[PDB]
UniProtKB/Swiss-Prot annotation, chain A:
<dbReference type="GO" id="GO:0000724">
    <property type="term" value="P:double-strand break repair via homologous recombination"/>
</dbReference>
<dbReference type="GO" id="GO:0003682">
    <property type="term" value="F:chromatin binding"/>
</dbReference>
<dbReference type="GO" id="GO:0005634">
    <property type="term" value="C:nucleus"/>
</dbReference>
<keyword id="KW-0143">Chaperone</keyword>
<dbReference type="GO" id="GO:0006334">
    <property type="term" value="P:nucleosome assembly"/>
</dbReference>
<comment type="similarity">
    <text>Belongs to the nucleosome assembly protein (NAP) family.</text>
</comment>
<comment type="function">
    <text>Acts as a histone H2A/H2B chaperone in nucleosome assembly, playing a critical role for the correct expression of genes involved in root proliferation and patterning. Required with NRP2 for the maintenance of cell proliferation and differentiation in postembryonic root growth. Involved in both intramolecular and intermolecular somatic homologous recombination.</text>
</comment>
<keyword id="KW-0175">Coiled coil</keyword>
<keyword id="KW-0539">Nucleus</keyword>
Curated annotation (Swiss-Prot), chain B:
<dbReference type="GO" id="GO:0006334">
    <property type="term" value="P:nucleosome assembly"/>
</dbReference>
<comment type="similarity">
    <text>Belongs to the nucleosome assembly protein (NAP) family.</text>
</comment>
<feature type="coiled-coil region">
    <location>
        <begin position="6"/>
        <end position="47"/>
    </location>
</feature>
<dbReference type="GO" id="GO:0005737">
    <property type="term" value="C:cytoplasm"/>
</dbReference>
<protein>
    <recommendedName>
        <fullName>NAP1-related protein 1</fullName>
    </recommendedName>
</protein>
<dbReference type="GO" id="GO:0005634">
    <property type="term" value="C:nucleus"/>
</dbReference>
<dbReference type="GO" id="GO:0003682">
    <property type="term" value="F:chromatin binding"/>
</dbReference>
<dbReference type="GO" id="GO:0042393">
    <property type="term" value="F:histone binding"/>
</dbReference>
<dbReference type="GO" id="GO:0000724">
    <property type="term" value="P:double-strand break repair via homologous recombination"/>
</dbReference>
Length: 172, 173
C-alpha cells in the first residue's frame, strides 16, 4: 500500500538526485569557465600596462630591489650578500599561464653581473586533482641565501599578490 | 624641500608610476564587477535547480543528517553528544544575498528536539562595502560543533563549497 509507494519513491528519488547533481556539476563547470574567461580577458588588458610600468621603472635605478626590501615579509629574506646581487636586479615579472588556471611564473631579470651568467631566473608553478609542480632556472654561477628559493610557497604568493600588484606602496 | 632636491626625472617617474597604479586599480575593479556579474547570473540559474533538489530530498529519510555525519572533515567535528543532536537535523540551506557580494547564510533546520528550542540555527556572513565583514549567528536556546555559532571560517567554507554543493557523494559513503 502506502509503504510500497514510499519504498518505490525512495528508490526513484535517489536516482533523480543523482541526475540533479549531474546537472549542477555541468552548471558549476560552465560558471567557473566563465569566471576564468573574465580573468583571461583582463590579463590581456593589463599586459601593455605592466609593460609601460616596466618601462618607467628603468628610470629608477634600484626600484625593484628597494620595493622588495621595504616589504615587511620579503625584506628580511635577503642576506647581506644577496643584497649585493640584488643590485643587478633590474626587472621582476609575473605572468599567468594563458588559461590562468594551470599556473604562472615569476622571473627576476638581471643585468650583466659577476655572480652568475643568467639574464633571468625563473620559478614556474604548474598545476592542473589539487597538486602543483615547481621548476626553476638552475643558476649558472660564475667561477669566483634567498637564492635557495630557485629549486605552500608563501614567498611566491606575496610576490604575486602584493609586490607585483603594487610595488609602489612599498617603495613609497 | 623634499621633492625640490630630487632629480627631475626621478620625481616624474614616481608620478607616472602612481598614475599607472591608478590605471591598474581601475582595471582590477572592472574585472571584479565582471566576475560579480557572472556569479549573479549563475546564482539565478542554479536557484530552481536547488529548489528541485530540495523537493526530491523530502523523499529520502535523514538525508541531510546522513550526509553531514558521513562527511570526513565535518563528521570529525561532532562530539558524541553533538551526534545525538544532529539526529534531529532535517535540512541544510545555503543562500547567497541577491547580489552575491553582500554575503551569505548557512541554516540548519532541526525538528523538535529535547536539546534546544530553535527550529533554525543560522550563521550569516555579511560583507561590508568597507573592509572587514560582520558575522552573525543564532543564540542557541537550550532546554563542540555548536561553538561554531559565535558572532566572532574553515567549517563555513567546507559546508558552503563542499557539503552543500554535492551532498549526494557523502550520502552514498
Ligand atoms: Ca537532465
Ligand atoms: Ca560567456
Ligand atoms: Ca639634487
Amino acid at each position: 500500500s502506502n509503504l510500497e509507494q514510499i519504498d518505490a519513491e525512495l528508490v526513484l528519488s535517489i536516482e533523480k538526485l543523482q541526475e540533479i547533481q549531474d546537472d549542477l556539476e555541468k552548471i558549476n563547470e560552465k560558471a567557473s569557465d566563465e569566471v576564468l574567461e573574465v580573468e583571461q580577458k583582463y590579463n590581456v588588458i593589463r599586459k601593455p600596462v605592466y609593460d609601460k610600468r616596466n618601462e618607467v621603472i628603468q628610470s629608477i635605478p634600484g626600484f625593484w630591489m628597494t620595493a622588495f626590501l621595504s616589504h615587511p615579509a620579503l625584506g628580511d629574506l635577503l642576506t647581506e650578500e644577496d643584497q649585493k646581487i640584488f643590485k643587478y636586479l633590474n626587472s621582476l615579472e609575473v605572468e599567468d599561464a594563458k588559461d590562468v588556471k594551470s599556473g604562472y611564473s615569476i622571473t627576476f631579470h638581471f643585468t650583466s653581473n659577476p655572480f652568475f651568467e643568467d639574464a633571468k631566473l625563473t620559478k614556474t608553478f604548474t598545476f592542473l586533482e589539487g597538486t602543483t609542480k615547481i621548476t626553476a632556472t638552475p643558476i649558472k654561477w660564475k667561477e669566483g641565501s634567498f637564492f635557495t628559493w630557485f629549486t605552500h610557497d608563501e614567498v611566491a604568493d606575496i610576490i604575486k599578490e602584493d609586490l607585483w600588484s603594487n610595488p609602489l606602496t612599498y617603495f613609497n
